[PDB]
Structures are given as structure tokens and as C-alpha cells.
């Protein structure tokens, strides 16, 4: 894949350019397996779902990439107590890798709150994709006024999801969508980096950066195969 910015990335093919016309944000013509071809598409392999899913992954990954390294950075700076300076994979998400005791409840009590909270947030978001505008109709404590959407599932907008109504013009909004997707793709690769480096090294992402800078030649993936 061609990094940075380019008219087309390395993997672009004449076949992919038939349907990748540049309208979608981040359309650099990179679809070697042809997953976005509209002809005879169905199921979840279709342009709308796949584009919607990429944005969803991008936004979760951006939260994850910042959240999986923030406690270590702030812990190094001394802004938070050392007790909460923990590696992302030792916070209790994977108890075998380590867990933090000190939350106001055990992680299974917390997890039930997550299920109920995410079911509401996720299933309502699903209904706007399946039935556009349907979340603004039924009574939801007066909050249905901000769940109308815009006809494009990935960009609901509205008085809350677009709180400061940024990107007022079409050119401005198009520019912002490109920035959202490129930061999102960068974050998605960063999360993959965090996972692989945790398995390879057993240390946090911030330690890996510090050690690579200390001695780049002797600290890298090639020297991490051995021990």
C-alpha cells in the first residue's frame, strides 16, 4: 500500500477504477480483492455496509489508540498516580494477562452495565441504518429530536452528533471526512501494532517506543524474535 497521499495507491488496479470514482472519502483506488464492486453484491459485502463499517472501525480505533497508551504517557509524566499507570492489556480486559483491582466494582458487574448501555446505543444506531429516520419518531424522553440522522448512516450529524456544526460547506465537510478517515486508518493500524507488540514483547506501547529510541539498532522486531 502507498502511504501518505497520492492519486492512487500501489495496489490500485484498472478493475477497481471502474466503480471507485473518488466520491467516497479516502477513495485512493485501493481495492485489489474487489470487495466494493456493486454488480451482483449482497449480504454484508456491499458498498453501503462496507463503507459504514470502515468508519465505525476507524472511530473505535481512534479511541482505542489514544486510550491504550494514555495511562502510560500520563503515568510517565507523573500526572496520575503510579497505581493507575498500567499497560492496556493488564487493565482487566484479559485477566490472564493481569487485572487491576481497585475499580468501584468487579469487571463482571461493570460488564453488565456495558452490555445494557451498548445494546441501547448500538441497536438504535442499527435501526437508523435499516430504517433511515426511524429513531426520530418514537418517544425516547424527548431525545428523539436529535436522532433524525441525515440519510447517510455513517454521518448522522444533528444538534448533538454535530455539536458545533462544523463543515458547514460541502467542500469543508468533504475535507473533514477525508481527515477523519485517514486518522482512522492510521489508528486502526496502530491498534494492530499494539496487539502484535504486546505478544512479541510483553511490554506496553510506550515502553516499546522508549526502548527503540534508546538504541534503535538493538531494539526492533528483528531482535525481539529471540530473548
Amino acid at each position: 500500500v502507498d502511504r501518505s497521499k497520492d492519486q492512487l495507491y500501489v495496489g490500485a488496479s484498472q478493475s477497481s477504477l471502474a466503480y471507485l470514482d473518488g466520491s467516497l472519502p479516502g477513495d485512493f483506488g485501493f481495492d485489489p480483492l474487489g470487495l466494493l464492486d456493486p454488480v451482483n453484491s449482497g449480504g454484508f459485502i456491499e458498498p453501503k455496509w462496507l463503507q459504514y463499517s470502515e468508519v465505525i472501525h476507524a472511530r473505535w480505533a481512534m479511541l482505542g489508540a489514544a486510550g491504550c497508551i494514555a495511562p502510560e504517557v500520563l503515568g510517565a509524566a507523573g500526572l496520575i498516580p503510579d497505581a493507575t499507570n498500567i499497560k492496556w492489556f493488564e487493565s482487566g480486559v484479559i485477566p490472564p494477562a493481569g487485572s487491576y483491582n481497585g475499580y468501584w466494582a468487579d469487571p463482571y458487574t461493570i460488564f453488565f452495565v456495558e452490555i445494557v448501555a451498548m445494546q441501547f446505543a448500538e441497536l438504535r444506531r442499527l435501526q437508523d441504518f435499516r430504517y433511515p429516520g426511524s429513531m426520530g419518531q418514537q418517544y425516547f424522553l424527548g431525545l428523539e429530536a436529535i436522532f433524525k440522522g441525515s440519510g447517510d448512516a455513517a454521518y448522522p450529524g444533528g444538534p448533538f452528533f454535530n455539536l458545533f456544526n462544523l463543515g458547514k460547506t460541502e467542500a469543508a465537510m468533504k475535507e473533514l471526512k477525508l481527515k477523519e478517515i485517514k486518522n482512522g486508518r492510521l489508528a486502526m493500524l496502530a491498534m494492530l501494532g499494539y496487539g502484535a507488540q504486546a505478544v512479541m514483547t510483553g511490554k506496553g506501547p510506550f515502553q516499546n517506543l522508549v526502548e527503540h529510541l534508546a538504541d534503535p539498532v538493538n531494539n526492533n522486531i528483528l531482535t525481539n524474535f529471540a530473548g
Binding site: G11, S13, Q14, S15, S16, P32
Partner: peptide
């Protein structure tokens, strides 16, 4: 070639 990958290499050397 079905895909017809694009390449700027003078000899058409693709990825």
C-alpha cells in the same frame, strides 16, 4: 490479466 494492476515502472513490474 484480469485485474490489470497499475504500475509506473517502465517495464510494467507490479507489486
Amino acid at each position: 490479466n484480469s485485474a490489470g494492476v497499475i504500475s509506473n515502472d517502465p517495464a510494467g513490474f507490479t507489486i
